[PDB]
Amino acid sequence: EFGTREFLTFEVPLAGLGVSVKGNRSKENHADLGIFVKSIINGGAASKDGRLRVNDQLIAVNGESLLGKANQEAMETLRRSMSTERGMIQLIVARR
Amino acid sequence: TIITL
């Protein structure tokens, strides 16, 4: 249910992004599919900026890639990369 | 399983 996705990038000015994310997994194929935007908190930084979209797959944060990582490791990478962040988050996403 | 950033 991933489709054919294009890679997009944008800069999000800045608590936090105000974004909830979740790992997706196919149980029939026993495969992690990546980290996806589940909700954008109304009135948070990503909401005010408008360029992030629900169901986007998160690919990179400030150049730190989430690819080649199981969902647990990618989530940890996300948290670690956001822990050091007025500011600017450069996101790479994959969008259907 | 759901994290908020």
Residue numbers in the entry:
A (entry chain L): 5 to 18, 24 to 94, 98 to 108
B (entry chain A): 86 to 90
Passage from the reporting paper:
Among them, the Par (partitioning defective) complex, the first set of genes identified in polarization of Caenorhabditis elegans embryos during development, are evolutionarily conserved master polarity determinants from worms to mammals. The Par complex plays indispensable roles in diverse polarity-related contexts, such as asymmetric cell division (ACD), establishment of apical–basal polarity in epithelial cells, oriented cell migration, and neuronal polarization. Par3 has three PDZ (PSD-95, DLG, and ZO-1) domains that mediate protein–protein interactions. Mammalian Par3 PDZ3 specifically recognizes Par6 PBM, and the Par3/Par6 interaction can be significantly enhanced by Par3 NTD and Par6 PB1 through their oligomerization.
The crystal structure of Par3 PDZ3 in complex with a Par6β PBM peptide revealed that the last three residues of Par6β PBM (−2ITL0) binds to the αB–βB groove of PDZ3 using a classical PDZ binding mode. The carboxyl terminal of L(0) from Par6β PBM forms extensive hydrogen bonds with the canonical “G600LG602F” loop of Par3 PDZ3. The sidechain of I(−2) from Par6β PBM inserts into a shallow hydrophobic pocket formed by the αB–βB groove of Par3 PDZ3. In line with the structure, the G600,602 A mutation of Par3 PDZ3 dramatically weakened the PDZ3–PBM interaction ~20-fold. We further found that addition of 1,6-hexanediol impaired the hydrophobic interaction between Par3 PDZ3 and Par6β PBM. Overall, Par3N specifically binds to Par6β via the PDZ3–PBM recognition, and both Par3 NTD and Par6β PB1 enhance the interaction likely through oligomerization-induced avidity increase. As a key driving factor for the specific interaction and LLPS of Par3N and Par6β, Par6β PBM is completely conserved in Par6γ but varies in Par6α. As expected, Par6γ PBM but not Par6α PBM bound to Par3 PDZ3 equally well as that of Par6β PBM. We then constructed a Par6α chimera mutant, with its PBM replaced by the Par6β PBM, and the puncta formation property was gained in cells co-expressed with Par3N and the Par6α chimera, further demonstrating the critical role of PBM–PDZ3 recognition in promoting puncta formation of Par3N in living cells. Par6β promotes Par3N LLPS, relying on the specific interaction between Par3 PDZ3 and Par6β PBM, as well as the high valency of both proteins.
